[PDB]
């Protein structure tokens, strides 16, 4: 997955999330056109395949010809009561996308973190199945303690949790941020 956020001079906005699913998709590249093909068929649930340990198949998400598979993606635009864009945000990174998009919103809107901080801030993830809270390597360890004493089993993510690109309206203009976990950087005028 990759996410990008755009705000134009007239105040219009686009939040665009795009995907070939796993890294390098299906691993099928055309020697002629160079197109690298998705393996989005794997986003469907199958009656056969063992999903994880004790995660069953979801019948709403079974393969049917012409059907689209369920996705974690959620490119979002937040607009204020006066009609001006307040936030353009979304994430990449498989099943952590929805949780990371929620966190970036929580961090900026409620905790009052500026956009760069809200993107860079350590994240955590729990999706119910599997039954584990993953936390990022540099999370506040008081938070790890607060979770463990409330009986969460946590584990640390070997790499990182998702990638977030965001733009937020400020009195100074349009503040933008790309996630250093992937190496991006914004541009504007």
């Amino acid at each position: 997955t990759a996410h990008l956020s755009v705000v134009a001079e007239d105040g219009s906005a686009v939040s665009a999330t795009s995907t070939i699913n796993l890294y390098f998709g299906s691993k099928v590249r055309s020697p002629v056109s160079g197109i690298l093909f998705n393996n989005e068929m794997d986003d469907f649930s199958s009656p056969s395949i063992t999903n994880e340990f004790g995660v069953p198949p979801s019948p709403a998400n079974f393969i049917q010809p012409g059907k689209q598979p369920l996705s974690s993606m959620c490119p979002t635009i937040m607009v204020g009561q006066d009609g001006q864009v307040r936030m353009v945000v979304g994430a990449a990174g498989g099943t952590q996308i929805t949780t990371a998009t929620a966190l970036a919103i929580i961090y900026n809107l409620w905790f009052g973190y500026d956009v760069k901080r809200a993107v860079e801030e350590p994240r955590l993830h729990n999706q119910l199945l599997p039954n584990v809270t993953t936390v990022e390597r540099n999370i506040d360890q008081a938070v790890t303690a607060a979770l463990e004493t409330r009986h969460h089993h946590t584990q640390i993510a070997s790499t990182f949790i998702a990638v977030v690109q965001a733009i937020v309206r400020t009195a100074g203009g349009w503040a933008a941020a790309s996630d250093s976990r992937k190496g991006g950087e914004p541009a504007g005028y």
């Binding site: 099928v28 055309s30 160079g34 393996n39 395949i49 393969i63 979002t76 635009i77 955590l124 203009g173």
Partner: protein, 343 residues
Amino acid sequence: DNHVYTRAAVAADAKQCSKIGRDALRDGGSAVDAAIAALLCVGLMNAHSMGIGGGLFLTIYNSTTRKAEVINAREVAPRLAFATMFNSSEQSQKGGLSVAVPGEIRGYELAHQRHGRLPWARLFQPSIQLARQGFPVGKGLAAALENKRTVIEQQPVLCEVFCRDRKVLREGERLTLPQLADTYETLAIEGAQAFYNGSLTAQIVKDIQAAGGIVTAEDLNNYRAELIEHPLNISLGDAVLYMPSAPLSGPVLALILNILKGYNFSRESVESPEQKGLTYHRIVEAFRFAYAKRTLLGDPKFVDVTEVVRNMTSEFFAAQLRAQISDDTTHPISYYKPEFYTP
């Protein structure tokens, strides 16, 4: 350098692509032209994540009409697909059989027809140059190349572009994409028809089928990007949030935020370790209640999701789940009532 801009901004996961977006804006592009131009670039520099072989969704807001819309250009199962077609994870993850019908280019076209200000060819120009000239491999791509080193090095058609002297490219080394540059050139001159019903089509089908796939020319000819005039929204204080409904995860996002809004989080929620730890505990619990309902979702054209979705965006429903969050403990999976079938 501060990345606060007076007039306009592009946030992408590669500096070069944010820049290509920005120049589109400067030359008079709409936000859509800029998104398309930048996406074409990201498909080169972050080739492991996304590209013209995949699918997309755009959420678009027009500041003048004050309307939001969604473009659905996500992949679809081929016409020859069926529920029991795979018997292992490996079958669904590798080879031509795992390939769904790509929607990306039809999505760019629809978005551009409705909202474009620059010519179609102009959106491809900087990416054609970049793919032909080459670029140093970025942080994200280098880590993906490392992760999947074994598969890349054993597959000569990927090693062709993603290796140097038979080993995966590392950060800083030069990546060139000469075939894709030519494909982009064709798309720019012949339009989207070249991919779906034109000069690239038979080669697409041949490549997918040679690797064991079942996508046909008919699949491509029939693919349609979809305009959704009324995207999901929720109210949050004095703001509204627009996002895609099913088959995407806007309803999960909506449920997480509606659960949490009744706690009235502010700066004080994270000011001391005692508040901070309770606040993050509540976040995890709302994740778990919202992921419980996720398994009922699927493509709304094939699955009746309207009541599931009405619940997940209901504030009252969210207050019901909030009242079941214990401050002092998390719970076993069954407590959240994950559901695989409607009552």
